[PDB]
Design a protein around this nucleic acid. Sequence first.
DNA 1: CCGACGCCGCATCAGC
DNA 2: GCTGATGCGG
DNA 3: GTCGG
Length: 326
Amino acid sequence: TLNGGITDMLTELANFEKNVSQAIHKYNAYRKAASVIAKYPHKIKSGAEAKKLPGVGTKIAEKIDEFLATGKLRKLEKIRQDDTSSSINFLTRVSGIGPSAARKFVDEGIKTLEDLRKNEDKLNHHQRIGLKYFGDFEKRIPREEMLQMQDIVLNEVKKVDSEYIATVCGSFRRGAESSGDMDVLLTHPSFTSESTKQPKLLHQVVEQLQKVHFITDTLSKGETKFMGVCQLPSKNDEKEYPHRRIDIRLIPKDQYYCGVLYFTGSDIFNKNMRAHALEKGFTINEYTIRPLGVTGVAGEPLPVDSEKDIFDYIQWKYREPKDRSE
DNA sequence: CCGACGCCGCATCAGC
DNA sequence: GCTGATGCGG
DNA sequence: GTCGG
Ligand SMILES: Nc1ccn([C@H]2C[C@H](O)[C@@H](COP(=O)(O)CP(=O)(O)OP(=O)(O)O)O2)c(=O)n1
Ligand SMILES: [Cl-]
Ligand SMILES: [Cl-]
Ligand SMILES: [Cl-]
Ligand SMILES: [Cl-]
Ligand SMILES: [Mg+2]
Ligand SMILES: [Mg+2]
Ligand code: NA
Ligand code: NA
């Protein structure tokens, strides 16, 4: 937190541009600046010093100078004062309300938590769940609770079929001391890039977790991705744990390493690695790394037997998950 | 100066 | 129904 | 908003 004041400023700017301006590239520009400053190992003393970093340009350098001189940014002070912007920013904090729905709601005069409750009939299913658990979804998950959740998921998956492999990814696999949610990568030998020899592979796992009352609600569910809600069991007389977001990704077993690279993140790390891949003539998704032809169309998948193989193709030194939290 | 900015699953809607 | 575009979030 | 060519 050497530069926490500056990085906070940039994150609030990114959030404004995404939620209010609906300018996604400015959102990513600010987040990239925040990320490169967050790993800068000195306490930044000037905008000129910051502008040396890749992704900090003239405009952000000027803002950093204003912030360093005064402790504030007038642009943000004005934004915090604006009723419509503040209302749109707030509504997007509900899971399932994005910038478009938030502005639509605010236009209809729906601007507060109380307004959302009174107008629950105007919400789709995802948004209704996000409003129901708004408070809980604001709380972090201590790693100690992540470890308990991991134990339940891995044991329940094993009971369905001992040939499943479940891997907790996301910030947890990066070693974080707390997480916003739980991300579970799932494989089964019957599901590969070549064939699907069994149906309902994800369904069966979801059903087992619902059966033991771990999964409590479903936000979305398809053949390979589940997004929903779970809760640790509590003891007699003890307050219930907060409800938590969980999302599960079933990945073809022969594409495990591309999948665990993707699901480990961070999101900014994935964007930077995939951008570097492109510069090196490759494209990376959660399934494959493919070379780009002379016209730039993806070729055939390249052999991959470890995460490190993917780094080697694009000429990056390997980075352990804990060093991927960008 | 300017185009390019990672890549994709699921829910929902419009148009047919 | 299906396809394609869009919103949202992983 | 930033940057590479
Ligand atoms: N825009 C995105 C978003 C996510 N991903 C990948 C990388 C991320 O780590 C994983 C889980 O996302 P999550 O949304 O769960 C974020 P995570 O890194 O797990 O941190 P927490 O806030 O503690 O959950 O999904 C991506 O590639 N592109
Ligand atoms: Cl933009
Ligand atoms: Cl401020
Ligand atoms: Cl792979
Ligand atoms: Cl692919
Ligand atoms: Mg996560
Ligand atoms: Mg997640
Ligand atoms: Na720079
Ligand atoms: Na939201």
